[PDB]
């Protein structure tokens, strides 16, 4: 299976109410493993998965030092962006950064990414080649030229292809029981009087799943109500798909469940 390690940074300004609140979280696949909150009392990177607790004091000290410095730089970015956009000093604004690496089923580097957003919109992103940048607008062209001159891409490329892959493999090994597991969905259906048929998938991992309804074997794509996949809170995910069915015609409908954890796709019927 392919795997990923990703970090998500969010910083939100609050002028008059102190420095911006900075939040960072790290994930391997769909499993969160670390967090940092600038408002929390610890002022440290903290474990959020059992397998990262293995890491020694040097890891927590190093990640803390780095995360704090990242919090400081995104605080500066918020000031820089407010300036680039001639915005007021009184308003609250958001910066987001996401980066990470993917490995294939052979656990070798497949791709890297590093993206930035201002107020929830694309700002600047590193291209797949890990050598060039995509700037969203005029303001982002200033950053783009700044990062080209400073050879940021070359330095980031060394992290994405080297360090990121190294630690992702390490985590996959150390957290094998959690990370290299597949929990097949537990499924069932409900019926609500026209009638609603709802297909359920619970307790599955990873989060990637396909739920489809068919009427006489034809996909009902434009008529299926599909909810966002949601966390159960115990490390697994849940999802449902529903269709409004002519009363009495339930026998014509089948729900199909596809997930990496199933030996074979499942078919559900209202019986």
């Amino acid at each position: 299976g392919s795997h990923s390690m990703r970090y998500f940074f969010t910083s939100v300004s609050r002028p008059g109410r102190g420095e911006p609140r900075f939040i960072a979280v790290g994930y391997v696949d769909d499993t969160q493993f670390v967090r940092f909150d600038s408002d929390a009392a610890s002022q440290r990177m903290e474990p959020r998965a059992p397998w990262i607790e293995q890491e020694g004091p040097e890891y927590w000290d190093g990640e803390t030092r780095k995360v704090k410095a990242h919090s400081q730089t995104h605080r500066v970015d918020l000031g820089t962006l407010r300036g680039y956009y001639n915005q007021s000093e009184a308003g609250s604004h958001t910066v987001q950064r996401m980066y990470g690496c993917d490995v294939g089923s052979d656990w070798r580097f497949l791709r890297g990414y590093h993206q930035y957003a201002y107020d929830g919109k694309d700002y600047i992103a590193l291209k797949e080649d890990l050598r060039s940048w995509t700037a969203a607008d005029m303001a982002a062209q200033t950053t783009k030229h700044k990062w080209e001159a400073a050879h940021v891409a070359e330095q980031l490329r060394a992290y994405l292809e080297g360090t990121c892959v190294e630690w992702l493999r390490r985590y996959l090994e150390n957290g094998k029981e959690t990370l290299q597991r597949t929990d097949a969905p537990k499924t069932h259906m409900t019926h609500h009087a026209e009638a609603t048929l709802r297909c359920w998938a619970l307790s599955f991992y990873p989060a990637e799943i396909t739920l489809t309804w068919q009427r006489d074997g034809e996909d009902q794509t434009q008529d299926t109500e599909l909810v966002e996949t949601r966390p159960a809170g115990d490390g697994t995910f849940q999802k449902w798909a529903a269709v409004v069915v002519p009363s009495g015609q339930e026998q014509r409908y089948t729900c199909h469940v596809q997930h990496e954890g199933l030996p074979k796709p499942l078919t559900l019927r209202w019986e």
């Binding site: 970015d77 940021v152 992290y159 990121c164």
Partner: peptide, 9 residues
């Protein structure tokens, strides 16, 4: 593990 490179827009 975090990236250790500091960058600013």
């Amino acid at each position: 593990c975090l990236g250790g490179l500091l960058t600013m827009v």
